[PDB]
Homo-oligomer: A and B are copies of this chain.
Amino acid sequence: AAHIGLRALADLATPMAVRVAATLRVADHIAAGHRTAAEIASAAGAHADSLDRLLRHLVAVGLFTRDGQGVYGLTEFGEQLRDDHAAGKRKWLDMNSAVGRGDLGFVELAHSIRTGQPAYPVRYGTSFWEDLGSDPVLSASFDTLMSHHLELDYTGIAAKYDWAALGHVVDVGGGSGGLLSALLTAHEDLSGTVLDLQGPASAAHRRFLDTGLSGRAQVVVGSFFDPLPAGAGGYVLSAVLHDWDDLSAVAILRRCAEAAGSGGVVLVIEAVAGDEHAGTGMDLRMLTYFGGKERSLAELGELAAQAGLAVRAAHPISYVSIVEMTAL
């Protein structure tokens, strides 16, 4: 529903102003005693007059407060901008994090809409994965973000499905290993391995070491486009397929089919078109980032088919779903 002006509906000043405040950690500086533009600016490394102008615009938006002496304060809503807030939103808007950086790729949406190709490269001169692969710090922030997305969307994932019955699970593209770390912590006799590029896989390793799970959890550095560790009880694809177009998606699913064999299970875990954490907005982000797409339960089925797999179940877990596929 649009009960707000067309031009205002297309405003970029506010979205960018919020992201800049999130990047300059303005809320943190405010709650830490810096109240005036002059202060916040020096504490953040910004131009005094310019920052003041950004703040005044954000006061109008409803995130800040400004008193007679130019003393800025946080609104009830502006609290969400603090890096220590419960919702952990600020890091998603930070222009330095992978997502706060990729989202700026939307400024090239026209290219995707015309060609069907990702926009991220247009603005950054390289794919998203290539970017993370050459910037270790950038890649770490992405690992942290997906780790947070797990808490956000996979709430209760442990019990919602019968994992223990798998014995050994392979988390294909499992990042820092947050999911496996959660599955194993809730299933004493379960073991598994995280398969991912070297950055996340090494982060997964560092985690299992500290977490005390190295005895049951292992990492394997590799591309899920090549053969995967074979014969596991289950292969999980958590928020992976939507990052790829149809050709790549079957490529990935196919590999899982091979490793799964006529006795394993392939579990695609993601927000299916319909879920409350799966909107048209997210679908366009997948398009602009990697040319991926959010898919319906029917569309995943078509992909499964082309990879010799068949959906057998689809349990909704909070904001997302777990679709279970087995040998055709």
Contacts and interface: CB of A to CB of B under 8 A. Distances in A.
Interface of A: 1-3, 6-7, 9-20, 22-24, 45-47, 49-51, 53-54, 56-57, 59-63, 75, 77-78, 80-81, 87, 89, 92-93, 95, 103-104, 106-107, 109-110, 112-116, 279-281, 283-285, 287, 293
Contacts of A284: 13, 17, 53-54, 57
B13 A281 contact: yes
B50 A114 contact: yes
Given A3-B62, A24-B113, 11 more contacts: A2-B61, A12-B12, A12-B15, A50-B113, A50-B115, A53-B284, A54-B109, A56-B280, A57-B281, A57-B283, A95-B110
A80 B80 CA distance: 34
B280 A53 contact: yes
Please state the number of chain copies in the assembly.
2
Contact of A115 (B47, B107, B279): B47
B50 A287 contact: yes
Contact of A18 (B9, B75, B112): B9
Contacts of A75: 2
